[PDB]
Amino acid sequence: XXXXXXXXXXXXXXXXXXXXXXXXXXXXXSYPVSLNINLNSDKLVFPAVTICTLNPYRYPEIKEELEELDRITEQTLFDLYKYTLPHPLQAKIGFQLCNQNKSDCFYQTYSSGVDAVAEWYAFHYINILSRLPETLPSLEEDTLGNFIFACRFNQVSCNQANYSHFHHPMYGNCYTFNDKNNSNLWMSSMPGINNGLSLMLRAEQNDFIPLLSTVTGARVMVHGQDEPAFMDDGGFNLRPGVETSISMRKETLDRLGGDYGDCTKNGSDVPVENLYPSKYTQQVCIHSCFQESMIKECGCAYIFYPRPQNVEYCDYRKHSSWGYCYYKLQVDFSSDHLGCFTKCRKPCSVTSYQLSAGYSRWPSVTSQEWVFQMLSRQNNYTVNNKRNGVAKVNIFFKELNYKTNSESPSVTXXXXXXXXXXXXXXXXXXXXXXXXXXX
Amino acid sequence: XXXXXXXXXXXXXXXXXXXXXXXXXXXXXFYTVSVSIKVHFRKLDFPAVTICNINPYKYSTVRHLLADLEQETREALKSLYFSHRIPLLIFQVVGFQLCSNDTSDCATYTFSSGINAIQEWYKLHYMNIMAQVPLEKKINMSYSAEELLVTCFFDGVSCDARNFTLFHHPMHGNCYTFNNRENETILSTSMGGSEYGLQVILYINEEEYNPFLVSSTGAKVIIHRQDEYPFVEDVGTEIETAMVTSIGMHLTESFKLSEPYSQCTEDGSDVPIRNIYNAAYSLQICLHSCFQTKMVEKCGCAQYSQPLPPAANYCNYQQHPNWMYCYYQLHRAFVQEELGCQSVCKEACSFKEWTLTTSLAQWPSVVSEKWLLPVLTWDQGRQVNKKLNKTDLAKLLIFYKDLNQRSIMESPANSIXXXXXXXXXXXXXXXXXXXXXXXXXXX
Amino acid sequence: XXXXXXXXXXXXXXXXXXXXXXXXXTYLSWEVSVSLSVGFKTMDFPAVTICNASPFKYSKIKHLLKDLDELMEAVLERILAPATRNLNFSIWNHTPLVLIDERNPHHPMVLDLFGASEKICNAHGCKMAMRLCSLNRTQCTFRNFTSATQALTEWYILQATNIFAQVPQQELVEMSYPGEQMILACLFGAEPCNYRNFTSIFYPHYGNCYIFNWGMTEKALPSANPGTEFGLKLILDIGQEDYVPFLASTAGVRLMLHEQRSYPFIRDEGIYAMSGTETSIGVLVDKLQRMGEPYSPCTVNGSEVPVQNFYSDYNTTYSIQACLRSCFQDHMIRNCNCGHYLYPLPRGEKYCNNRDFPDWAHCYSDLQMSVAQRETCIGMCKESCNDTQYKMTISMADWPSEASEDWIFHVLSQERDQSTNITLSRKGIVKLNIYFQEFNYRTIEESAANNIXXXXXXXXXXXXXXXXXXXXXXXXXXX
């Protein structure tokens, strides 16, 4: 009784020695994150503006082969609609798409004849355009004296503008003005319309092909500087005849690397090969593994994305099962079966551009008497009483700052375990003095 | 007690490490802020909507002010396709020679398109001819309160031009601002949606534009709060004249802290920069304020687009020959840090910002031209001359979408000293280790 | 000093008790930490709700409101430029349009017949308004209007609402826009879509509407690729010559974006899409992740709201705007036991008609322009944890070309092959294009900062440090 109340009394002042050493060990049982909002006042270095058309410019090489498509199109619409190729369409109208030595065929059916013909022509013209010789063009056709009337950024001209050029196979001609990283790059001193970019575009009403080019507008799209002109992301389709005031709100993102979250500072440790000549982004992994999956499955390269030098583009005369090879992989890619969303990580440098609009008709009743007389004497442009073809574009910054979503690590309370370490160090030592106090 | 001078000293040395760890996190949490994102429901204060027409003063009225300029303009159109101090030359490049009183450094201008080079010569003379016009004569020549305004609907209560105020602007004539009145309760929305927003039907005359100032047609609208300046010079969301342009918006707040933290000011108490605009502080207002301060001291006059300071009057080419090269001289140094407006002036912590998501449609339909157009002709009792065309009746809808006040605040971890009790206990524990080292030293 | 040390033992515990309140204040603070995740992932495609400003077909409704349309031309005759055989004054005597003159402040005069000597108040002092009389000609209020353009339109809405209320609902669907006529071409990019994949909601004020997909009919359709070629592509066919000529002035078509399984709110969030143009819309997924009910006031399920939801007929989920519209109908029933037409009627009740309740014109409009009535429903219903906004980037370009105007209209001229009527409006078709943008995720997730470590164990070891300090002097006394 006396010894039992003495030997058990030492377990009442020593039980807290491990009570703060086990509960604290179970508490932490991780990298913490934190967020800060900063408004960095920079010099507003002006981003690149990609200007594209909405008509695929036909080539003189393909001109003898493009008229054969219209011969089949006129024959089809006279029979089924009252108005050779290996894939005839026949009805609800549809489209037969088969594999080499396979009875099952995905019937590419459509509800209406408008989107049926516009996609039937988007299978032959997209495929036969891969037959072009990939060479430097021996006759430079400068449409900047025809398509863009005025390039006005910060009250000067664009005569000494080192511009890039690539023909998009679905939209047509394109122009990007700030792919270079030289000393003569553009920057916005003041957020003004008179201090911003002012453009005047010739949206061609009479299109080269009435089947694919079912629009008459003009595409204006902004992006980064080292980032590529992706143009399947989307931009401003603009009505011909109105002035568009495009205002931007730059919203960037700065996160931590692999020490805290799931992010990479640069595309170096990723397994996906950098197919673009640009910097790292999210599209450079998704749209390049999808290009290399076509190399693994078939012997074809896809046309909307760039091509490695060890393979050519695909053609139906070269590979008769290309349409089955693309349609089967596209419905398989959305189910995350290739795992390409999980292999490549997210970029730590994400710069997105918020895009608003403002619309106003560009000619007045006083301008139609005077501007079309002025414009016809300058660059040989005729007037059309139905619609106006020219369009004015104004790229504009809303304000000087831009919202930075910078992620920051935590302070240096994960050192509480070390605080409990010295606390437990003076716990068991003090407990021994309690039992020895009786003596 | 030879081992007792090291046993308690080990607890004393660990005490100071426990005191330092309770002090290192003490000062660090004092400067540590946290982002608090919270959206809640209340009576949202409707912002001061300013309507500005892109059309300047009436072209039939401004004939005897600018008869000499349009004859000089059409004469140059015949040769190529008040004083004469800056004729346009030929370099095929259309440009100017912005020379000063000394021709040792004459500024140059190079341009390509003729349609955009003819407008910029007309904008130069327009700043100075209307500069010598008095401000009392600018009110009768520009748009009145009954011309631009036709229908004023807001939450069922039919407002009028009596609620709008006369805000004159040198680039756009008379601007009129809704929900901005002195000694008046600010109107607030209660139900989200386009039905109970600001339903405004505008009117701009088609045969009465200025054919050389701006080619486009359509009034511009700026969403801004009450105390701040509207700043309709550069920022602008234009509206098509022929048909409707509905605008949705959202109230996004931004609160930061100034003095122990990232630098701001609330009334310009940090800088001696005088606020000419007489508005709330912002970074956009402070840049224009220091520009006109150095402009009067160097050039000797004030820019016509900027409002008047109490120092002197506007600029004029027939009064002053060399202010034009002086105006270009500042902008060469305003990009770099020669003026020091980036270095001296700070930012602003508390400011609001609206995100505009527009949408458009045909407001005159094919089955509404028989009744909607003659009633709007009947409603405009001042200008009954003809039936109003449908290309002149712009309708505007500004409204909150879902009545959301997305607020971002900043609150530190050590706000009140009761929250610093964890650091206060670290200091008392470290001080308890300070009475063991000296005790073991003597014994 | 063993007795003096005992007094300091309570003082040392007093500081621990003072720090114990800080541990309690931290737990009752309920602090959260926000975090950002921006990037493209596999997200289900949002429901696209299609409506129109014109609710019905005018060629199939003319025998319903023939008396009102004849009455409207008589009102426009005297106002614009000055006999009615069958004017049907009983419709006019429901809410007679009145006239208020402010030329004489000492004595205001009225002239309220309304069907250079017969012109009516072209000056500024005129105020054309209405009266609302609840069986008494002395308690008539005035809904004041200052512009007579849309005051006649707002009068026309209330007169039409009294007509559509007595019409039964199932018969009224057939005279609205059909699914085969309003939309004809549907495109998704990989799989075809028809009118049968759409389902219908009879909204009472904009007529028959259609949505692309729900979770109720089938499963959602995911799209795991950013692209304007992918995503929803729609070609509409709108009868601009078949509009109601006075109820809907705006000729555009309504496009809406909302959640996957939710009731599509029509005038809360809807953007116009212009005819003759390709309304190119890049969508965003703006999500807000509320961290539970004790940290922030929220209703994640919807059972916490005492007001019953009148949106259970469509079997939708809880939302924000479901409270504000159901209570405003519920506050109407507690004042006047008859239901308004623009809101869904409760089960067992009846829409409010002049043949049964002549007080409809004043009982509804007085509650409509009441700030304190609408303020009650804001503080009564609470918020929702899965807050999902939909930012969008609208850009439009003129769709039909000069080369396809001879071509593409002939294809549509025979897919509507009916033996009665066909719509061949050259400027009445709408091209649509809805797609995901580059970065869809703009999310705000909230992490719990109330751990067992910093809120309890941190104060435990700190108090133990002072407790060991009391034993530190005891160990020196035992040395």
Short mmCIF file of N, CA, C and O in Angstrom, two decimals, chain B residues 46 151-159 178 188-200 244 246-249 359 395-403, chain C residues 143 145 150 153-158 161 203-206 247 250 254 256 265-272 321 324-325 328 340-343 360 364-365 367-369 374:
data_model
loop_
_atom_site.label_atom_id
_atom_site.label_comp_id
_atom_site.label_asym_id
_atom_site.label_seq_id
_atom_site.Cartn_x
_atom_site.Cartn_y
_atom_site.Cartn_z
N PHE B 46 -23.43 50.86 -56.64
CA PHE B 46 -23.34 50.92 -58.09
C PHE B 46 -22.28 51.94 -58.49
O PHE B 46 -22.28 53.06 -57.96
N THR B 151 -33.25 57.58 -72.82
CA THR B 151 -33.93 56.73 -71.86
C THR B 151 -32.98 56.41 -70.72
O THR B 151 -31.86 55.96 -70.94
N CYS B 152 -33.44 56.66 -69.49
CA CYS B 152 -32.64 56.44 -68.29
C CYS B 152 -33.47 55.56 -67.36
O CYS B 152 -34.37 56.05 -66.67
N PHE B 153 -33.17 54.26 -67.35
CA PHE B 153 -33.84 53.30 -66.49
C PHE B 153 -32.85 52.71 -65.50
O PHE B 153 -31.74 52.31 -65.89
N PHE B 154 -33.25 52.64 -64.24
CA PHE B 154 -32.43 52.03 -63.20
C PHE B 154 -33.35 51.54 -62.09
O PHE B 154 -33.87 52.36 -61.32
N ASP B 155 -33.54 50.22 -62.02
CA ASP B 155 -34.33 49.53 -60.98
C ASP B 155 -35.78 50.03 -60.97
O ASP B 155 -36.39 50.23 -59.92
N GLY B 156 -36.33 50.27 -62.16
CA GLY B 156 -37.69 50.74 -62.31
C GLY B 156 -37.86 52.24 -62.22
O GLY B 156 -38.75 52.79 -62.88
N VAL B 157 -37.05 52.91 -61.40
CA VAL B 157 -37.15 54.36 -61.27
C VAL B 157 -36.58 55.01 -62.52
O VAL B 157 -35.41 54.81 -62.88
N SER B 158 -37.41 55.79 -63.21
CA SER B 158 -37.02 56.43 -64.45
C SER B 158 -36.26 57.71 -64.13
O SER B 158 -36.86 58.74 -63.82
N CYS B 159 -34.93 57.64 -64.21
CA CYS B 159 -34.08 58.81 -64.04
C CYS B 159 -34.11 59.68 -65.30
O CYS B 159 -34.78 59.37 -66.29
N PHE B 178 -23.46 59.01 -64.37
CA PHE B 178 -24.56 58.54 -63.54
C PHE B 178 -24.05 58.16 -62.16
O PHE B 178 -22.92 57.68 -62.02
N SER B 188 -27.69 51.97 -55.12
CA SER B 188 -27.16 50.63 -54.96
C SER B 188 -28.10 49.62 -55.60
O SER B 188 -29.32 49.73 -55.47
N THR B 189 -27.53 48.64 -56.29
CA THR B 189 -28.33 47.58 -56.88
C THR B 189 -28.74 46.57 -55.81
O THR B 189 -28.09 46.43 -54.77
N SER B 190 -29.82 45.86 -56.09
CA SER B 190 -30.37 44.89 -55.15
C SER B 190 -30.59 43.50 -55.75
O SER B 190 -30.50 42.52 -55.00
N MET B 191 -30.87 43.39 -57.04
CA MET B 191 -31.04 42.10 -57.70
C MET B 191 -30.15 42.06 -58.93
O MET B 191 -30.17 42.99 -59.74
N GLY B 192 -29.38 40.99 -59.06
CA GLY B 192 -28.50 40.86 -60.21
C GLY B 192 -29.26 40.54 -61.48
O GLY B 192 -30.33 39.92 -61.47
N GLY B 193 -28.69 40.97 -62.60
CA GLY B 193 -29.30 40.73 -63.89
C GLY B 193 -29.48 41.98 -64.72
O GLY B 193 -29.46 43.10 -64.19
N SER B 194 -29.69 41.81 -66.02
CA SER B 194 -29.81 42.93 -66.94
C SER B 194 -31.14 43.65 -66.85
O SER B 194 -31.29 44.71 -67.46
N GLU B 195 -32.11 43.10 -66.12
CA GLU B 195 -33.41 43.76 -66.00
C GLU B 195 -33.32 44.98 -65.10
O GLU B 195 -33.94 46.01 -65.38
N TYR B 196 -32.54 44.90 -64.03
CA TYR B 196 -32.45 45.97 -63.04
C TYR B 196 -31.05 46.58 -63.00
O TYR B 196 -30.52 46.90 -61.93
N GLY B 197 -30.45 46.76 -64.17
CA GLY B 197 -29.19 47.46 -64.31
C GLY B 197 -29.39 48.90 -64.72
O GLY B 197 -30.40 49.53 -64.39
N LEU B 198 -28.42 49.43 -65.44
CA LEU B 198 -28.48 50.79 -65.97
C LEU B 198 -28.82 50.69 -67.45
O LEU B 198 -27.96 50.37 -68.28
N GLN B 199 -30.08 50.95 -67.79
CA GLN B 199 -30.59 50.77 -69.15
C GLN B 199 -30.63 52.14 -69.83
O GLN B 199 -31.53 52.95 -69.57
N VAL B 200 -29.66 52.39 -70.70
CA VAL B 200 -29.45 53.69 -71.33
C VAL B 200 -29.55 53.52 -72.84
O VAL B 200 -28.89 52.65 -73.42
N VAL B 244 -27.37 47.07 -79.88
CA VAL B 244 -27.16 47.07 -78.44
C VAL B 244 -25.78 46.52 -78.11
O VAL B 244 -25.19 45.74 -78.86
N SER B 246 -24.53 45.14 -74.44
CA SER B 246 -24.75 44.90 -73.02
C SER B 246 -23.44 44.52 -72.35
O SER B 246 -22.66 43.74 -72.88
N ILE B 247 -23.21 45.08 -71.16
CA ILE B 247 -21.95 44.92 -70.44
C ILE B 247 -22.24 44.34 -69.07
O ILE B 247 -23.03 44.91 -68.30
N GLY B 248 -21.62 43.20 -68.77
CA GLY B 248 -21.62 42.65 -67.43
C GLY B 248 -20.34 43.02 -66.70
O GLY B 248 -19.31 43.28 -67.32
N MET B 249 -20.41 43.05 -65.37
CA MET B 249 -19.27 43.48 -64.58
C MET B 249 -19.27 42.74 -63.25
O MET B 249 -20.25 42.10 -62.86
N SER B 359 -21.41 41.77 -74.53
CA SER B 359 -22.22 40.93 -75.40
C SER B 359 -23.09 41.84 -76.25
O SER B 359 -23.59 42.85 -75.75
N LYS B 395 -27.98 51.35 -77.61
CA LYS B 395 -28.55 50.98 -76.32
C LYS B 395 -27.48 50.33 -75.45
O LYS B 395 -26.71 49.50 -75.93
N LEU B 396 -27.44 50.72 -74.18
CA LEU B 396 -26.41 50.28 -73.26
C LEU B 396 -27.04 49.64 -72.03
O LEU B 396 -27.98 50.20 -71.45
N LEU B 397 -26.53 48.48 -71.64
CA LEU B 397 -26.97 47.77 -70.45
C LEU B 397 -25.75 47.45 -69.59
O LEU B 397 -24.87 46.70 -70.03
N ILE B 398 -25.71 48.01 -68.39
CA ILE B 398 -24.63 47.77 -67.44
C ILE B 398 -25.25 47.23 -66.16
O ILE B 398 -26.14 47.87 -65.58
N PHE B 399 -24.78 46.07 -65.71
CA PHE B 399 -25.45 45.35 -64.64
C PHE B 399 -24.48 44.38 -63.99
O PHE B 399 -23.53 43.90 -64.63
N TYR B 400 -24.72 44.09 -62.72
CA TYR B 400 -24.03 43.00 -62.04
C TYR B 400 -24.63 41.67 -62.47
O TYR B 400 -25.84 41.56 -62.67
N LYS B 401 -23.78 40.66 -62.60
CA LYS B 401 -24.26 39.37 -63.09
C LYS B 401 -24.94 38.58 -61.98
O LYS B 401 -26.14 38.30 -62.05
N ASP B 402 -24.20 38.22 -60.93
CA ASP B 402 -24.73 37.38 -59.87
C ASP B 402 -24.62 38.01 -58.49
O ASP B 402 -24.84 37.31 -57.49
N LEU B 403 -24.28 39.31 -58.41
CA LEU B 403 -24.16 40.09 -57.18
C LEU B 403 -23.12 39.45 -56.24
O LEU B 403 -23.43 38.88 -55.19
N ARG C 143 -46.65 54.28 -60.95
CA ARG C 143 -45.36 53.79 -61.40
C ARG C 143 -44.85 54.79 -62.44
O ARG C 143 -45.19 54.70 -63.62
N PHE C 145 -42.86 56.97 -65.07
CA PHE C 145 -41.91 56.82 -66.16
C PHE C 145 -41.68 58.18 -66.79
O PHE C 145 -42.59 59.01 -66.83
N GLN C 150 -40.06 52.81 -73.80
CA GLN C 150 -40.16 51.49 -73.20
C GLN C 150 -41.14 51.45 -72.03
O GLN C 150 -41.35 50.37 -71.46
N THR C 153 -43.57 49.52 -73.52
CA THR C 153 -43.11 48.14 -73.55
C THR C 153 -43.32 47.46 -72.20
O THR C 153 -43.80 46.32 -72.13
N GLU C 154 -42.97 48.15 -71.11
CA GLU C 154 -43.21 47.62 -69.77
C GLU C 154 -44.69 47.51 -69.44
O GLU C 154 -45.07 46.67 -68.63
N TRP C 155 -45.53 48.36 -70.05
CA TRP C 155 -46.97 48.16 -69.96
C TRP C 155 -47.39 46.92 -70.74
O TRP C 155 -48.30 46.20 -70.32
N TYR C 156 -46.74 46.66 -71.87
CA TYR C 156 -47.08 45.53 -72.72
C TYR C 156 -46.68 44.20 -72.11
O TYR C 156 -47.30 43.18 -72.42
N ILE C 157 -45.66 44.19 -71.25
CA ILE C 157 -45.27 42.95 -70.57
C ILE C 157 -46.33 42.54 -69.56
O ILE C 157 -46.72 41.37 -69.50
N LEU C 158 -46.84 43.50 -68.79
CA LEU C 158 -47.82 43.19 -67.76
C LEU C 158 -49.18 42.83 -68.36
O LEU C 158 -49.93 42.04 -67.78
N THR C 161 -48.66 39.25 -69.67
CA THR C 161 -48.55 38.30 -68.56
C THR C 161 -49.92 37.91 -68.03
O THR C 161 -50.13 36.76 -67.60
N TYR C 203 -39.47 27.85 -70.18
CA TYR C 203 -39.41 29.06 -69.38
C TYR C 203 -40.56 29.97 -69.78
O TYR C 203 -40.81 30.15 -70.98
N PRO C 204 -41.29 30.53 -68.82
CA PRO C 204 -42.54 31.24 -69.16
C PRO C 204 -42.34 32.56 -69.89
O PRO C 204 -43.25 32.98 -70.60
N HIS C 205 -41.18 33.20 -69.77
CA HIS C 205 -41.07 34.52 -70.38
C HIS C 205 -40.27 34.51 -71.68
O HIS C 205 -40.49 35.35 -72.54
N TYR C 206 -39.33 33.57 -71.83
CA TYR C 206 -38.61 33.42 -73.09
C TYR C 206 -39.03 32.18 -73.87
O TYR C 206 -38.34 31.80 -74.83
N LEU C 247 -43.10 42.56 -77.80
CA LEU C 247 -42.57 42.04 -76.55
C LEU C 247 -41.05 41.95 -76.59
O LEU C 247 -40.38 42.14 -75.57
N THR C 250 -35.07 43.20 -79.02
CA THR C 250 -33.74 42.71 -79.35
C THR C 250 -33.82 41.46 -80.22
O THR C 250 -34.52 40.50 -79.89
N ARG C 254 -30.06 34.03 -77.34
CA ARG C 254 -29.51 33.93 -76.00
C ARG C 254 -28.64 32.68 -75.87
O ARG C 254 -29.07 31.57 -76.17
N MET C 256 -26.08 30.80 -72.94
CA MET C 256 -25.88 30.81 -71.50
C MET C 256 -24.90 29.71 -71.12
O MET C 256 -24.77 28.70 -71.81
N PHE C 265 -30.26 29.53 -64.94
CA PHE C 265 -30.87 30.84 -64.71
C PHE C 265 -30.68 31.72 -65.93
O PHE C 265 -29.58 31.81 -66.48
N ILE C 266 -31.76 32.38 -66.35
CA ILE C 266 -31.82 32.93 -67.70
C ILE C 266 -31.49 34.42 -67.70
O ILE C 266 -30.67 34.88 -68.50
N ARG C 267 -32.11 35.18 -66.81
CA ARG C 267 -31.78 36.60 -66.73
C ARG C 267 -30.75 36.90 -65.65
O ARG C 267 -30.36 38.06 -65.49
N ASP C 268 -30.29 35.89 -64.92
CA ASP C 268 -29.20 36.10 -63.98
C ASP C 268 -27.86 36.11 -64.70
O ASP C 268 -27.02 37.00 -64.49
N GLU C 269 -27.63 35.14 -65.58
CA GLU C 269 -26.39 35.07 -66.33
C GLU C 269 -26.62 34.57 -67.76
O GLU C 269 -26.77 33.37 -68.01
N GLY C 270 -26.68 35.50 -68.71
CA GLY C 270 -26.87 35.18 -70.11
C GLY C 270 -26.33 36.29 -71.00
O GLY C 270 -26.56 37.47 -70.74
N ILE C 271 -25.60 35.88 -72.03
CA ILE C 271 -24.98 36.80 -72.98
C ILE C 271 -25.70 36.69 -74.32
O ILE C 271 -26.20 35.61 -74.67
N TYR C 272 -25.76 37.80 -75.05
CA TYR C 272 -26.37 37.79 -76.37
C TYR C 272 -25.39 37.27 -77.42
O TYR C 272 -24.18 37.46 -77.30
N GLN C 321 -29.22 31.50 -56.71
CA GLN C 321 -30.39 32.24 -57.16
C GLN C 321 -31.70 31.47 -57.01
O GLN C 321 -32.76 32.02 -57.29
N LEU C 324 -33.66 33.27 -54.05
CA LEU C 324 -34.17 34.62 -54.23
C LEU C 324 -35.41 34.66 -55.10
O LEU C 324 -36.25 35.56 -54.95
N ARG C 325 -35.57 33.69 -56.00
CA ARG C 325 -36.75 33.65 -56.85
C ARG C 325 -37.89 32.85 -56.22
O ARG C 325 -39.06 33.17 -56.46
N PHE C 328 -39.49 35.11 -53.34
CA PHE C 328 -40.26 36.24 -53.85
C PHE C 328 -41.61 35.79 -54.40
O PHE C 328 -42.57 36.56 -54.40
N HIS C 340 -47.52 34.14 -59.58
CA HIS C 340 -47.11 34.95 -60.72
C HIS C 340 -46.62 34.05 -61.85
O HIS C 340 -46.11 32.95 -61.63
N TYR C 341 -46.78 34.54 -63.08
CA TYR C 341 -46.55 33.71 -64.26
C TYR C 341 -45.07 33.50 -64.56
O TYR C 341 -44.67 32.41 -64.98
N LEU C 342 -44.23 34.52 -64.35
CA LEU C 342 -42.82 34.43 -64.70
C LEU C 342 -42.02 33.52 -63.77
O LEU C 342 -40.86 33.21 -64.09
N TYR C 343 -42.58 33.09 -62.65
CA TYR C 343 -41.93 32.16 -61.75
C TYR C 343 -42.67 30.83 -61.75
O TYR C 343 -43.86 30.79 -62.07
N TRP C 360 -54.04 41.80 -58.78
CA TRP C 360 -52.74 41.29 -59.21
C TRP C 360 -51.79 42.40 -59.63
O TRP C 360 -50.58 42.28 -59.44
N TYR C 364 -48.29 42.71 -56.90
CA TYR C 364 -47.00 42.25 -57.40
C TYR C 364 -46.00 43.39 -57.57
O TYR C 364 -44.82 43.24 -57.21
N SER C 365 -46.43 44.53 -58.11
CA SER C 365 -45.51 45.63 -58.37
C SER C 365 -45.09 46.37 -57.11
O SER C 365 -44.02 46.98 -57.10
N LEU C 367 -44.53 44.78 -54.20
CA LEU C 367 -43.47 43.91 -53.70
C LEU C 367 -42.25 43.93 -54.60
O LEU C 367 -41.15 43.62 -54.13
N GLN C 368 -42.42 44.29 -55.87
CA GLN C 368 -41.29 44.30 -56.80
C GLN C 368 -40.35 45.46 -56.51
O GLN C 368 -39.13 45.28 -56.43
N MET C 369 -40.90 46.66 -56.36
CA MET C 369 -40.11 47.85 -56.03
C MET C 369 -40.10 48.08 -54.52
O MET C 369 -40.49 49.13 -54.01
N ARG C 374 -36.81 42.60 -50.63
CA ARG C 374 -35.74 41.85 -51.28
C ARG C 374 -34.55 41.65 -50.35
O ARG C 374 -33.81 40.67 -50.49
#
